Short mmCIF file of C-alpha atoms and ligand atoms in Angstrom, two decimals:
data_model
loop_
_atom_site.label_atom_id
_atom_site.label_comp_id
_atom_site.label_asym_id
_atom_site.label_seq_id
_atom_site.Cartn_x
_atom_site.Cartn_y
_atom_site.Cartn_z
CA UNK I 1 -1.62 -18.21 -5.68
CA UNK I 2 0.01 -17.93 -2.39
CA UNK I 3 2.46 -14.46 -2.72
CA UNK I 4 5.29 -13.70 -0.49
CA UNK I 5 6.28 -10.60 -0.15
CA UNK I 6 9.64 -10.46 0.23
CA UNK I 7 9.77 -8.92 -3.63
CA UNK I 8 6.97 -5.97 -4.73
CA UNK I 9 3.79 -8.12 -4.99
CA UNK I 10 3.42 -6.90 -8.78
CA UNK I 11 0.72 -8.65 -11.42
CA UNK I 12 0.22 -8.60 -15.67
CA UNK I 13 -3.11 -6.65 -15.74
CA UNK I 14 -5.62 -5.40 -18.41
CA UNK I 15 -7.22 -2.45 -18.92
CA UNK I 16 -9.57 -0.50 -21.35
CA UNK I 17 -7.65 -3.11 -23.36
CA UNK I 18 -4.14 -2.85 -22.90
CA UNK I 19 -2.10 -4.82 -20.78
CA UNK I 20 0.00 -3.59 -17.70
CA UNK I 21 1.87 -4.02 -14.98
CA UNK I 22 0.14 -3.59 -11.34
CA UNK I 23 1.39 -3.27 -7.38
CA UNK I 24 -1.49 -5.57 -5.77
CA UNK I 25 -1.43 -2.83 -2.42
CA UNK I 26 -3.82 -3.35 0.13
CA UNK I 27 -2.65 -0.45 2.23
CA UNK I 28 -5.04 1.72 -0.89
CA UNK I 29 -8.10 2.41 0.02
CA UNK I 30 -8.58 2.42 -4.31
CA UNK I 31 -7.27 1.52 -7.59
CA UNK I 32 -5.66 3.79 -9.15
CA UNK I 33 -3.96 3.50 -12.86
CA UNK I 34 -1.10 6.14 -14.97
CA UNK I 35 -2.81 7.95 -17.48
CA UNK I 36 -4.80 7.03 -19.92
CA UNK I 37 -7.86 6.59 -21.49
CA UNK I 38 -11.53 4.65 -20.32
CA UNK I 39 -14.69 4.66 -21.89
CA UNK I 40 -17.22 7.06 -20.47
CA UNK I 41 -18.13 9.58 -17.76
CA UNK I 42 -15.54 9.66 -15.22
CA UNK I 43 -15.21 13.07 -12.79
CA UNK I 44 -12.25 14.79 -10.85
CA UNK I 45 -10.62 13.70 -6.94
CA UNK I 46 -8.30 14.70 -4.95
CA UNK I 47 -6.46 11.29 -3.52
CA UNK I 48 -3.79 12.12 -0.90
CA UNK I 49 -0.25 9.10 -0.13
CA UNK I 50 2.45 10.37 1.01
CA UNK I 51 3.88 13.40 -0.63
CA UNK I 52 0.55 14.77 -0.73
CA UNK I 53 -2.41 14.75 -2.97
CA UNK I 54 -2.64 14.01 -7.07
CA UNK I 55 -5.42 15.17 -9.08
CA UNK I 56 -7.18 12.05 -10.42
CA UNK I 57 -10.12 11.17 -13.15
CA UNK I 58 -12.54 9.46 -11.38
CA UNK I 59 -14.22 6.30 -13.93
CA UNK I 60 -16.57 3.81 -12.43
CA UNK I 61 -17.93 0.46 -13.71
CA UNK I 62 -14.22 -0.32 -15.62
CA UNK I 63 -13.49 -3.80 -15.79
CA UNK I 64 -10.56 -5.27 -15.14
CA UNK I 65 -8.79 -8.74 -15.20
CA UNK I 66 -6.21 -9.02 -12.54
CA UNK I 67 -3.15 -12.09 -12.62
CA UNK I 68 -6.45 -13.87 -14.90
CA UNK I 69 -8.95 -13.04 -12.52
CA UNK I 70 -12.27 -10.61 -13.56
CA UNK I 71 -13.05 -7.74 -11.34
CA UNK I 72 -15.67 -4.65 -12.35
CA UNK I 73 -15.04 -1.15 -9.89
CA UNK I 74 -14.07 2.15 -10.45
CA UNK I 75 -10.40 3.12 -11.45
CA UNK I 76 -8.84 6.76 -10.72
CA UNK I 77 -6.45 7.68 -13.55
CA UNK I 78 -3.66 9.79 -13.06
CA UNK I 79 -0.30 10.70 -12.04
CA UNK I 80 0.58 8.58 -10.07
CA UNK I 81 4.38 6.96 -10.37
CA UNK I 82 2.86 3.27 -9.71
CA UNK I 83 0.14 1.59 -10.89
CA UNK I 84 -1.68 0.20 -8.15
CA UNK I 85 -4.90 -2.50 -7.38
CA UNK I 86 -6.11 -1.04 -4.43
CA UNK I 87 -9.09 -2.92 -1.83
CA UNK I 88 -11.92 -1.66 -4.14
CA UNK I 89 -9.90 -4.58 -6.55
CA UNK I 90 -9.05 -6.72 -3.74
CA UNK I 91 -11.64 -7.80 -2.32
CA UNK I 92 -13.10 -9.00 -5.97
CA UNK I 93 -11.11 -11.18 -6.35
CA UNK I 94 -11.03 -12.56 -3.31
CA UNK I 95 -7.62 -11.60 -2.20
CA UNK I 96 -6.63 -11.89 2.18
CA UNK I 97 -3.54 -11.44 4.00
CA UNK I 98 -2.55 -14.29 6.20
CA UNK I 99 -0.07 -14.65 8.48
CA UNK X 1 -4.77 -15.04 11.41
CA UNK X 2 -6.53 -14.72 7.70
CA UNK X 3 -7.56 -10.74 7.00
CA UNK X 4 -10.53 -9.87 4.26
CA UNK X 5 -9.95 -6.56 3.02
CA UNK X 6 -13.53 -5.24 2.66
CA UNK X 7 -12.28 -2.59 4.93
CA UNK X 8 -9.08 -1.22 6.35
CA UNK X 9 -6.84 -4.08 7.35
CA UNK X 10 -5.19 -2.17 11.03
CA UNK X 11 -3.68 -3.53 13.30
CA UNK X 12 -2.85 -2.56 16.75
CA UNK X 13 1.52 -2.33 17.38
CA UNK X 14 3.76 -1.99 19.88
CA UNK X 15 6.84 0.33 19.67
CA UNK X 16 9.05 1.82 22.21
CA UNK X 17 6.08 0.85 24.55
CA UNK X 18 3.33 2.68 23.30
CA UNK X 19 0.58 1.54 21.78
CA UNK X 20 -0.52 2.19 18.09
CA UNK X 21 -2.61 1.95 14.94
CA UNK X 22 -1.42 0.74 11.53
CA UNK X 23 -1.90 0.10 7.48
CA UNK X 24 -0.96 -3.02 6.46
CA UNK X 25 0.92 -2.79 3.55
CA UNK X 26 1.56 -4.48 0.77
CA UNK X 27 1.98 -1.68 -1.67
CA UNK X 28 4.72 -0.38 0.82
CA UNK X 29 8.46 -1.63 1.05
CA UNK X 30 8.98 0.02 4.16
CA UNK X 31 7.62 0.57 7.44
CA UNK X 32 6.94 4.05 8.22
CA UNK X 33 5.75 5.80 11.46
CA UNK X 34 4.56 9.10 12.89
CA UNK X 35 6.85 11.17 14.17
CA UNK X 36 7.67 9.68 17.55
CA UNK X 37 10.98 9.56 19.88
CA UNK X 38 13.34 6.65 18.83
CA UNK X 39 16.44 4.80 20.26
CA UNK X 40 19.69 5.12 18.80
CA UNK X 41 20.80 7.06 16.00
CA UNK X 42 18.99 7.98 12.87
CA UNK X 43 19.99 7.56 8.91
CA UNK X 44 18.35 10.23 5.91
CA UNK X 45 15.69 8.13 3.43
CA UNK X 46 14.33 10.01 0.72
CA UNK X 47 10.96 8.11 0.39
CA UNK X 48 8.49 8.29 -2.60
CA UNK X 49 5.09 7.58 -2.36
CA UNK X 50 2.20 8.86 -4.62
CA UNK X 51 2.07 12.67 -3.83
CA UNK X 52 6.18 12.75 -4.53
CA UNK X 53 8.73 12.52 -1.98
CA UNK X 54 9.54 13.68 1.86
CA UNK X 55 12.42 12.85 3.59
CA UNK X 56 12.18 10.91 6.74
CA UNK X 57 14.39 9.49 9.05
CA UNK X 58 15.56 6.09 9.46
CA UNK X 59 16.09 4.01 12.74
CA UNK X 60 17.42 0.75 12.34
CA UNK X 61 17.34 -2.93 14.65
CA UNK X 62 14.37 -1.14 15.96
CA UNK X 63 12.09 -3.73 18.50
CA UNK X 64 8.57 -3.34 17.29
CA UNK X 65 5.04 -6.01 18.14
CA UNK X 66 2.88 -6.26 15.19
CA UNK X 67 -0.53 -8.41 15.89
CA UNK X 68 1.17 -10.08 18.07
CA UNK X 69 4.11 -11.06 16.88
CA UNK X 70 7.60 -9.78 16.79
CA UNK X 71 10.00 -8.09 14.37
CA UNK X 72 13.36 -6.05 14.64
CA UNK X 73 14.33 -3.89 12.07
CA UNK X 74 13.86 -0.41 10.48
CA UNK X 75 11.30 1.70 10.90
CA UNK X 76 11.27 5.67 8.93
CA UNK X 77 9.58 8.41 10.55
CA UNK X 78 8.99 10.73 9.56
CA UNK X 79 4.99 13.26 8.39
CA UNK X 80 3.00 10.38 6.69
CA UNK X 81 -0.47 10.43 6.98
CA UNK X 82 -1.31 7.41 8.53
CA UNK X 83 1.34 4.00 10.07
CA UNK X 84 2.34 2.09 7.82
CA UNK X 85 3.82 -2.06 8.37
CA UNK X 86 5.32 -2.82 5.56
CA UNK X 87 7.51 -5.42 3.48
CA UNK X 88 10.62 -5.11 5.74
CA UNK X 89 8.23 -5.93 8.26
CA UNK X 90 5.36 -8.31 7.21
CA UNK X 91 7.79 -10.61 5.82
CA UNK X 92 9.01 -10.90 9.33
CA UNK X 93 5.50 -12.34 10.11
CA UNK X 94 4.65 -14.14 8.04
CA UNK X 95 2.59 -12.77 5.71
CA UNK X 96 1.75 -13.75 2.33
CA UNK X 97 -0.84 -12.84 0.25
CA UNK X 98 -3.53 -15.58 -1.08
CA UNK X 99 -5.85 -15.08 -3.78
C1 LIG D 1 -7.73 6.70 -2.57
O1 LIG D 1 -7.23 5.58 -3.11
C2 LIG D 1 -5.41 5.48 -2.77
C3 LIG D 1 -4.95 6.85 -1.52
C4 LIG D 1 -3.82 6.99 -2.45
C5 LIG D 1 -2.67 5.87 -1.86
S1 LIG D 1 -1.22 5.45 -2.04
O2 LIG D 1 -0.52 5.63 -3.34
O3 LIG D 1 -1.11 7.59 -2.00
N1 LIG D 1 -0.90 4.48 -0.80
C6 LIG D 1 -2.00 4.95 0.47
C7 LIG D 1 -0.38 5.14 1.50
C8 LIG D 1 1.01 5.31 1.75
C9 LIG D 1 -1.58 5.39 3.01
C10 LIG D 1 -0.80 3.07 -1.28
C11 LIG D 1 0.41 2.72 -0.74
O4 LIG D 1 0.62 0.97 -0.91
C12 LIG D 1 2.44 3.60 -1.51
C13 LIG D 1 1.90 2.79 -2.46
C14 LIG D 1 2.91 3.17 -3.95
C15 LIG D 1 4.06 3.01 -4.44
C16 LIG D 1 4.99 3.63 -5.28
C17 LIG D 1 4.83 4.24 -5.47
C18 LIG D 1 4.26 5.27 -5.24
C19 LIG D 1 2.93 4.54 -4.38
N2 LIG D 1 3.09 2.46 -1.53
C20 LIG D 1 3.97 3.45 -0.53
O5 LIG D 1 3.39 4.77 -0.16
O6 LIG D 1 5.44 3.51 0.26
C21 LIG D 1 6.29 3.93 0.36
C22 LIG D 1 7.06 3.70 1.60
O7 LIG D 1 7.71 2.45 0.83
C23 LIG D 1 7.78 3.27 0.40
O8 LIG D 1 7.61 2.19 -1.40
C24 LIG D 1 7.11 2.59 -2.33
C25 LIG D 1 7.30 4.22 -1.98
O9 LIG D 1 8.36 3.94 -2.64
C26 LIG D 1 8.52 4.45 -4.16
C27 LIG D 1 7.70 4.24 -0.16
C28 LIG D 1 -3.70 4.79 -3.35
C29 LIG D 1 -5.32 4.57 -3.27
CL1 LIG D 2 -15.48 0.33 -6.41
CL1 LIG D 3 -14.59 -12.42 0.75
NA1 LIG D 4 -18.61 4.55 -16.75
#
């Protein structure tokens, strides 16, 4: 699709068997999802943004379906105020910025 | 242009006669730039990001060039970790997300 930016670019994602709403976010290096359980090993990480850093759990090799497109990669899980799809998974679905 | 997301989508902007680097950020409702001087009055705004909230200075109707495209609109000034071009000005330069 072609998504205009008059409003937040929100899409439906499926992760760990759950549907969620998430923001397609070109300013995010990494994908960050609100607290949930995911299978396998994880390790602790700090990520920042406006207002400071949060502690998250880093899970690798997680499959997510993003607006119908499957992608695999690292997902960070923690107390983010919004689910964010960052560039690590936007590249895999072939997303580009055009103007 | 068409900008892929394998690297941060950084562009040059021109504001107050100064060149700066900024991130094209579809996850940002608003444009936020590092402390600098701008003309006119400002108004208070609270904005919320991954770590929490910061206070910023809201300047309206500021002239700003983004990757060679002219925009005139609201610019927030405060302690952001990186200069961010949000949807308020991405729409003025005609940006869309495509996959
Ligand atoms: C290391 O990997 C990551 C590191 C950092 C981030 S981030 O969330 O902190 N952020 C990085 C930016 C700030 C350098 C991604 C942003 O797109 C973030 C994504 C975002 C969106 C909403 C809530 C929280 C975070 N957006 C904002 O902080 O937007 C601010 C400014 O405009 C307002 O609109 C939305 C926010 O108002 C709520 C305000 C994500 C992944
Ligand atoms: Cl990854
Ligand atoms: Cl590509
Ligand atoms: Na894993």
